[PDB]
């Protein structure tokens, strides 16, 4: 069935958004923001007016998608009118962004028709000579994660960028993107004064009909590139119009928990791709049993699923450690006290099962630390940045120089949570109460 | 080691190997948990 292959491929690239530009899908709740971004970028590229605007919205809220759609829209009709410089706040640092701007400037100006050669002082003053200072070429700056350059110490790059926006003869468009709602408070006073205070907040999903209409936009094939298109559109419209269908129930569950269309797309894609024929795809979209299987797999390495993989000695040691941590006031325990509780519990069970020695319980203890059931007391864990991690790697911690049986640990799961989802018919269930 | 002791004293050989593996699992699953590598180590130490 090559027609099913064509329909499956079309549905898959609609779900990945990799359509041609004229066929790109804009959701109805995203349309006002898309028009506002289109007006700003058209006033920059067509009409040579300088602009400064920060896009504020959560992750996966189509900030990059709308900007890329607008730039590819103006790419096909005004190609020689503008160049694009892309900076990302994670990849680029305050010194490295100068070199990135210079290298993108030379490779973008060689694409239409050196600036990037020398030390950092020379490169920066050459960029300033080009920008600080027929039609003029617009320079569009796309600044992702712009909050990292609005720091508390100094904001040199944002100062010079907004100075180029407000006081230069080359027209420049600067788009910032961030997740921080209070991005204007991050800005220094002179940087905020040079900024235009134009902040666009990305639209959120307000009602369930927005999610259903977006799913309808994603899964309806609007071109007749397969013979199965009409039946697929009919069955999809039948499932979406029915309020009691399984797909509507999954959309409602997403609206109540995640409220994220990329989250739903990540489940819809293997439902579409794992089907082998047209009727199998129709049964899959009518039942959505694969969505249940996917949801079960997404939770299988959580705290609930990791406990169900434990052995009887592992579960007994974990219960004993949770008992010792509950009785403690700092919630702290070690291997010796947990082994004392374990041997007490085994004696009171066999008085009313093999007792293992401390040498063999050492391995189960190490596995429980490895599976993130226990953690070291007041441990910071993974550091935020490379500098603090580098500082931590050059320090010898006091919990790594004492013997293992005296190291203080704290529970990632408490005894009440242990009682909740260990089954009532289990052997050690009675000792989850204290 | 196995063939050297058969000489010095094919489904049957698979039977005794699988029975050894099941005995190792039944003796040390509470010790190893579901660690494949720990049971591989115990099999390699206790086979000869
Ligand atoms: N150029 C693109 N073409 C097609 N789909 C894209 C493109 N850029 C992003 N997407 C898709 O858009 C969805 C999320 O939007 P996007 O990546 O724009 O989020 P964002 O709000 O800019 O994110 P962040 O704050 O993390 O940078 C995802 O499904 C992603 O795959
Ligand atoms: Mg982005």
From Swiss-Prot, chain A:
Present with 2170 molecules/cell in log phase SD medium. It is found in: Nucleus. GO terms for cellular component: DNA replication preinitiation complex; nuclear origin of replication recognition complex; nuclear pre-replicative complex; nucleoplasm; nucleus. Belongs to the ORC4 family. This is Origin recognition complex subunit 4. Component of the origin recognition complex (ORC) that binds origins of replication. It has a role in both chromosomal replication and mating type transcriptional silencing. Binds to the ARS consensus sequence (ACS) of origins of replication. It comes from the Eukaryota. GO terms for molecular function: DNA replication origin binding. Gene3D superfamilies: P-loop containing nucleotide triphosphate hydrolases (3.40.50.300). Component of the origin recognition complex (ORC) composed of at least ORC1, ORC2, ORC3, ORC4, ORC5 and ORC6. The keyword Phosphoprotein applies. Keywords: DNA replication, DNA-binding, Nucleus, Phosphoprotein. GO terms for biological process: DNA replication initiation; pre-replicative complex assembly involved in nuclear cell cycle DNA replication; silent mating-type cassette heterochromatin formation.
UniProtKB/Swiss-Prot annotation, chain B:
It is found in: Nucleus. Belongs to the ORC5 family. Component of the origin recognition complex (ORC) composed of at least ORC1, ORC2, ORC3, ORC4, ORC5 and ORC6. Interacts with ORC6. Component of a cullin-RING ligase (CRL)-like complex composed of at least the cullin RTT101, a linker protein MMS1, and the potential substrate receptor ORC5. Interacts with RTT101 and MMS1. Component of the origin recognition complex (ORC) that binds origins of replication. It has a role in both chromosomal replication and mating type transcriptional silencing. Binds to the ARS consensus sequence (ACS) of origins of replication. This subunit is a candidate for the mediation of ATP-dependent binding of ORC to origins. May also be a substrate targeting component of a cullin-RING-based E3 ubiquitin-protein ligase complex RTT101(MMS1-ORC5). Present with 768 molecules/cell in log phase SD medium. This is Origin recognition complex subunit 5. It comes from Saccharomyces cerevisiae (strain ATCC 204508 / S288c) (Baker's yeast). The chain holds residues 214 to 267 of 479 of the full protein.
């Amino acid at each position: 069935d090559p027609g099913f292959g064509s329909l499956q491929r079309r549905l898959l690239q609609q779900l990945y958004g990799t359509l041609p530009t004229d066929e790109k899908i804009i959701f109805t709740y995203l349309q006002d923001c898309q028009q506002e971004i289109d007006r700003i970028i058209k006033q920059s590229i067509i009409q040579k007016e300088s602009h400064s605007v920060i896009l504020v919205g959560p992750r996966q809220s189509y900030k990059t998608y709308l900007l890329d759609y607008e730039l590819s829209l103006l790419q096909q009709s005004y190609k020689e009118q503008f160049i694009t410089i892309r900076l990302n706040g994670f990849i680029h640092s305050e010194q490295t962004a100068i070199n990135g701007i210079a290298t993108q400037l030379e490779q973008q100006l060689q694409k239409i028709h050196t600036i990037s050669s020398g030390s950092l002082t020379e490169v920066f003053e050459k960029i300033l000579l080009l920008l600080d200072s027929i039609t003029k070429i617009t320079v569009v700056f796309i600044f992702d994660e712009i909050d990292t350059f609005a720091g508390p110490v100094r904001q040199t790059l944002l100062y010079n960028l907004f100075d180029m926006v407000e006081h230069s003869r080359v027209p420049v468009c600067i788009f910032g993107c961030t997740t921080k709602l209070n991005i204007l408070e991050y800005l220094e006073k002179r940087v905020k004064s040079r900024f235009s205070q134009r902040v666009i907040y990305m639209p959120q999903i307000q009602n369930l009909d927005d999610m259903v209409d977006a799913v309808r936009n994603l899964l309806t094939v609007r071109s007749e590139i397969s013979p199965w298109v009409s039946q697929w559109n009919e069955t999809l419209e039948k499932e979406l119009s029915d309020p009691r269908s399984n797909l509507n129930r999954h959309i409602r569950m997403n609206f109540e928990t995640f409220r994220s269309l990329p989250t739903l797309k990540n489940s819809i894609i293997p439902l579409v791709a794992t089907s082998k024929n047209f009727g199998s795809l129709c049964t899959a979209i009518k039942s959505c049993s694969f969505l249940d299987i996917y949801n079960k797999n997404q939770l299988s390495n959580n705290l609930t699923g990791r406990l169900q993989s434990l052995s009887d000695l592992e579960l007994a040691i974990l219960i004993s450690a949770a008992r010792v941590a509950l009785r403690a006031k700092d919630g702290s325990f070690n291997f010796n006290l947990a082994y004392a509780e374990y041997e007490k519990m085994i004696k009171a069970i066999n008085s009313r099962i093999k007792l293992w020695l401390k040498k063999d319980v050492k391995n189960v203890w190490e596995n429980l630390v490895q599976l993130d059931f226990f953690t070291e007391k007041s441990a910071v864990g993974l550091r935020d940045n490379a500098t603090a991690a580098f500082y931590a790697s050059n320090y010898q911690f006091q919990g790594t120089m004492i013997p293992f049986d005296l190291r203080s640990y704290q529970m990632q799961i408490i005894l009440q949570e242990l009682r909740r989802i260990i089954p009532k018919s289990n052997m050690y269930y009675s000792w989850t109460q204290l | 080691c196995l063939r050297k002791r058969i000489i010095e004293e094919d489904d049957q050989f698979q039977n005794v190997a699988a029975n050894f593996i099941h005995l190792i699992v039944q003796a040390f699953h509470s010790y190893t948990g579901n660690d494949i590598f720990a049971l591989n180590d115990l099999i390699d130490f206790k086979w000869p």
